Amino acid sequence: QPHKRWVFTLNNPSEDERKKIRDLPISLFDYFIVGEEGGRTPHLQGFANFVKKQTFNKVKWYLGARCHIEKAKGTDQQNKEYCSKEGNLLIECGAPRS
Amino acid sequence: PHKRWVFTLNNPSEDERKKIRDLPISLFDYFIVGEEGRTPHLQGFANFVKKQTFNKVKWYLGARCHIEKAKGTDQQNKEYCSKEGNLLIECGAPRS
């Protein structure tokens, strides 16, 4: 079952892993935010709200194999707040839908 | 070369709108383009990461675009591009 909204984390991300995420097209998303957190072991904290419904395999293809991804929960704005809670954003793109 | 540009596209194709929307997140520090319009119209603002000049920008945004170097605050061009309030693309953050 594909869903539209995914959350995801990446502990200790490589720079090639950072560029894979930033190299995504702006059109993939209604809303996209990934903050950097932690620097005793920095992890990425990301929430993606895709335009189309996406499948696990497709969310992993886009973000990276090493990401831990699962269906998101809560309002768009709620996860925006969760992802920008250490105040070091890497990517924001779009606007939070309902 | 400059980093900050402004552009319009008069009556812009669906293939022209998805060409602009298809662009990488990693090209811009700020990027906004709203739709305005009886003759609809695309008003944008691109604050790249790298310095780019004309022929680079027009390979990215689209040939028949009307581009030029920007002037005003980034939150000024943001207010300009969202005056009509129908946003197509916002990506990054309005810088210094």
Tab-separated table of C-alpha atoms in Angstrom, chain B residues 1-5 27 48-57 60 69:
chain	number	residue	atom	x	y	z
B	1	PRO	CA	27.535	36.288	-13.530
B	2	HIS	CA	25.150	36.760	-10.594
B	3	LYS	CA	23.518	34.647	-7.906
B	4	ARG	CA	20.140	36.442	-7.695
B	5	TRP	CA	17.764	36.644	-10.675
B	27	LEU	CA	20.516	24.550	-7.222
B	48	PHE	CA	21.138	30.121	-6.772
B	49	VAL	CA	23.958	28.573	-4.737
B	50	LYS	CA	26.548	29.049	-7.490
B	51	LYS	CA	27.020	32.215	-9.508
B	52	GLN	CA	25.244	31.753	-12.833
B	53	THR	CA	24.863	33.916	-15.913
B	54	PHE	CA	22.118	34.280	-18.554
B	55	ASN	CA	22.805	31.244	-20.726
B	56	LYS	CA	22.998	28.998	-17.654
B	57	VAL	CA	19.738	30.339	-16.192
B	60	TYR	CA	17.356	25.864	-16.467
B	69	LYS	CA	19.510	40.134	-12.272
